[PDB]
Amino acid sequence: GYDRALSIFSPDGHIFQVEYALEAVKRGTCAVGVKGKNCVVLGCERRSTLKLQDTRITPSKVSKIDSHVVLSFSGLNADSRILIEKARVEAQSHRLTLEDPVTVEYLTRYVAGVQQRYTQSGGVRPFGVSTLIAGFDPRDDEPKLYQTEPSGIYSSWSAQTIGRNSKTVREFLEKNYDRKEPPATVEECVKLTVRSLLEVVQTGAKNIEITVVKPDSDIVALSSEEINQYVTQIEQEKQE
């Protein structure tokens, strides 16, 4: 079998293949995650270079791993499918062996472990993908939002963004998001998520996707018109 060590250390103590995988994430479309008091919202950019697209059947950016957990990403699209599939298999495998659904932290730890394994295994390259994993643990009303990256490190975030121009939207979130008082309602949480994407997106038409996840496996995706109403209200307040 092909055993070649592709991810290796350099004289300055860097693993270039892992670092170049982060550059692939930088190229990917922007993804954002914001957790409110009783919910988490996942926002995603859709680049408008591709029109004549069939939005019914095109792979959506946010993916359900289980009925209570979701996963969005930035980077190579094909690579993300492999992580999502593995995560979905592990979620069912956990229910089957332990008789409880996975916690958001556990699912994140698993996906992060898969990414890490591909940084020190022979004959494979790292995943060019960073993920945002969000949801609610079984019988728990505390929101959960985690981030992973090609190296395999993971951590919890009050709010976070990844992908292209993520530096800008993170700048926005750092000054707008208050920890002492997070978005109390769904509206406030979605509004803040849309506002953050409007710093980068371009047009607020079909370029913004929003997915709200509430406790007890209550997950819904907002439509174009629903999002467009947020876009309208934000700019009308801005004209002042």
């Binding site: 550059e23 019914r56 059947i57 492999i82 995943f127």
Partner: protein, 244 residues
């Protein structure tokens, strides 16, 4: 040892691109243009054969349009030999699904499976990727008529109208201009041929330089029919639309 001669096909560039995938796409850009257009009552697949000869046996020839099952077909752009490897795998996958669930495979599931195979060659194994881009035209009872494309990266997307191969930039602009959502198959047939006729590198678009196919609910009652056009039938539709 052997390491000396390894090209390392599955690595990132400093910019975060996959060398071999990008170079495979460069190969595909020289291939004959293939176009797919989805309408409300069917799907059109049109493709251009590359600089043919008069001594080529056209009626028994197939280099662009292939049948995966009764409901799904594909248009090819790139290395034909590479495409046939994948096509046969996809044909088997569709039959496996049919044997397991006793239902015809949904279009997307077949597309995802082939795209996952392509993805694997970019992440592990140390082998060159498949130098192929597909346009999938198919039907199922969930989403109805569907168009997809996949490329050597293993990434796939859905489309109302799309082109692969040569002159896709020019072709996509022309499709974006004249395409409308309430369009019908007969209109889509005309759009596909008109787009090829303007983007082609050849002097004139003729029947012997084309492969053509439609997927229609224009079959007797609630069912779908695949029509791979014969040379004489391509000649007739070229006269009908007013190109020759």
């Amino acid at each position: 040892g052997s390491r000396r001669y390894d090209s390392r096909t599955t690595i990132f560039s400093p910019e975060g691109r996959l060398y071999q995938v990008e170079y495979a796409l460069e190969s595909i850009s020289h291939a004959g243009t293939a176009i797919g257009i989805m309408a409300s009552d069917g799907i059109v697949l049109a493709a251009e054969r590359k600089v043919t000869s008069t001594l080529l046996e056209q009626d028994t020839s197939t280099e662009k349009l292939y049948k995966l099952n009764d409901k799904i077909a594909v248009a090819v752009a790139g290395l034909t030999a590479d495409a046939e490897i994948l096509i046969n795998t996809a044909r088997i996958h569709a039959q496996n699904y049919l044997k397991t669930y006793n239902e015809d495979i949904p279009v997307e599931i077949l597309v995802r499976r082939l795209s996952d195979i392509k993805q694997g060659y970019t992440q592990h194994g140390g082998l060159r990727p498949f130098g192929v881009s597909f346009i999938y035209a198919g039907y199922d009872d969930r989403y109805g008529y569907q168009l997809y494309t996949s490329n050597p990266s293993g990434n796939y997307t859905g489309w109302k109208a799309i082109s692969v191969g040569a002159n896709t930039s020019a072709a996509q602009t022309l499709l974006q201009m004249d395409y409308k959502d309430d369009m019908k198959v007969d209109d889509a047939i005309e759009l596909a041929l008109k787009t090829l006729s303007k983007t082609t590198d050849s002097s004139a678009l003729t029947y012997d330089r084309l492969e053509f196919a439609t997927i229609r609910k224009g079959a007797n009652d609630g069912e779908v029919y695949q029509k791979i056009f014969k040379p004489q039938e391509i000649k007739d539709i070229l006269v009908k639309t007013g190109i020759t």
